[PDB]
Amino acid sequence: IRVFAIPPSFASIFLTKSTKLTCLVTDLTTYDSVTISWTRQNGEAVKTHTNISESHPNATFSAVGEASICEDDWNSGERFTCTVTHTDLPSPLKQTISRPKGVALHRPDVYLLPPAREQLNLRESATITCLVTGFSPADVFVQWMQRGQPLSPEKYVTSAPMPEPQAPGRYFAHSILTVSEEEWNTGETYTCVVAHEALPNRVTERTVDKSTGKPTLYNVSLVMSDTAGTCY
Amino acid sequence: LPPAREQLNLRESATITCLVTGFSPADVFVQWMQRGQPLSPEKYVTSAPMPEPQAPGRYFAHSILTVSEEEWNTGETYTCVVAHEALPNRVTERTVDKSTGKPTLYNVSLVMSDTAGTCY
Amino acid sequence: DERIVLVDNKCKCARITSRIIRSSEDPNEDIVERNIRIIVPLNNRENISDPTSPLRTRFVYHLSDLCKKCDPTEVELDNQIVTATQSNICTETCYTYDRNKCYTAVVPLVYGGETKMVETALTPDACYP
Ligand SMILES: *[C@@H]1O[C@H](CO)[C@@H](O[C@@H]2O[C@H](CO)[C@@H](O)[C@H](O)[C@H]2NC(C)=O)[C@H](O)[C@H]1NC(C)=O
Secondary structure, eight states, X not given: OOEEEEOOOHHHHHHHOOEEEEEEEEEESOSTTOEEEEXXXXXXXXOOEEEEEEEOTTSOEEEEEEEEEOHHHHHTTOOEEEEEEOTTOSSOEEEEEOOOOOOOOBOOEEEEEOOOHHHHTTTSEEEEEEEEEEEBSSOOEXXXXXXXXXXXXXXXXXXXXXXXXXXTTOXXXXXXXXXXXXXXXXXXXXEEEEEOTTSSSSEEEEEEOSSSSSOSOOOOOEEEEOTTOOOO | OOOOTTTGGGSSOEEEEEEEEEESSSOOEEEEEETTEEOOGGGEEEOOOEEOTTSTTOEEEEEEEEEOHHHXXXXXXXXXXXXXXXXXXXXXXXXXXXXXXXXXXXXXXXXXESSOOEEO | OOOEEEEEOSSSOXXXXXXXXXXXXXXXXXXXXEEEEEEXXXXXXXXXXXXXXXXXXXXXXXXXXXXXXXXXXXEEOSSOEEEEBSOSOOOOOOOSEETTSOOEEEEOOEETTEEOOEEEEOSSSXXXX
């Protein structure tokens, strides 16, 4: 029996404006003897709603507990613990989740790399990478789009942040999206959207296509008329 | 109209021309200025409105100012203030100068870059 | 110090300077020089406020509509003060961005079904809210 506690994310705060706590419990044999509750440091009771999921193929059951807390409760760093009690566990399981302090704010940087030249020759698929680096803390939210249409959560993948060996305190992550070769050869556009607290407007976006980003040639035309006009 | 090239070779004087045209009715007031102070009236002569042969109902007039050649070569500025009833703001102004005229040189320069997408 | 700036456009990044060189010694044989400096962007698109617009590969620079004055000036006539129109010639396209200006956009953000449109920053840094 293992318990996973997920602290609230910045995206959930921005796009929903309601701080929530979740301590998922798995590897449960009986769902009629489970209880999920949250207790404060001083012992004040917190209202928690417990939900029961379906039956997993491995003869296990998962319980989901969603509870409403004030943004201050989490942002203050107040240490919270989720209480899980079961008849098969001689001692209740306790998990400690909190937000660390002494963290500065650093604006992240975003760059897109176009698909490799020798990948398009096979005419199978193309891969685009969105590299975001130089940020703290380590909670980011990257979403891909195609000419204003949000893309499905399944066509792109993202990686957990990892420390940067060069400069400590600044992290990085990247998102990889695949596309059809003909679709990319047509000339469609793609956008990378990242949400973080350090940004002034809190969201930034960048756009790449076939004509921009490692192109083959540059075609320019210039016209300069009325060169002998009145200036005064 | 800036002074003629064949006039300044005599090292004597210059002549600037302020031309007002195509207006109705035939009422016009022209006055010259320099550095914001009115010039002496004699330095210039203004004529009466005259009909335009190519357009019925329209007139035109002229004004002539005389200045020294060294003053024009120094780089002084002049102004022609014209007032007529049909103007949107009733007063118009133009300025002529030696530097802002016909240039002998056109040093054009063009710089191409793929990263300078903004200009301060 | 020896050059005077006439126009300092930012959208077309155009800058014009004029200067008189005292060539030889005759006052009537001094040349008048006009310099034009243009910086063209190769990555910006047709509409700088819409990332989906196609790329731009044609640039037109009219000098008659660049060195133009469009602000009423005050003139003293010894009996009153009046406002005077500098030129009668007075939708222009902005090729490049302006540092003194902020460029923003609207983008749909989906999360758990709900869609929250949020103001973005097309420019890298520019100004802050
Ligand atoms: C260039 O893009 C801008 C921004 O999309 C266009 O102007 C916007 O038009 C929409 C409606 O279509 C309005 O909601 C916005 O308020 C407009 N922007 C501003 C700043 O007023 C503009 O029309 C586009 N230009 C062309 C030629 O397509």
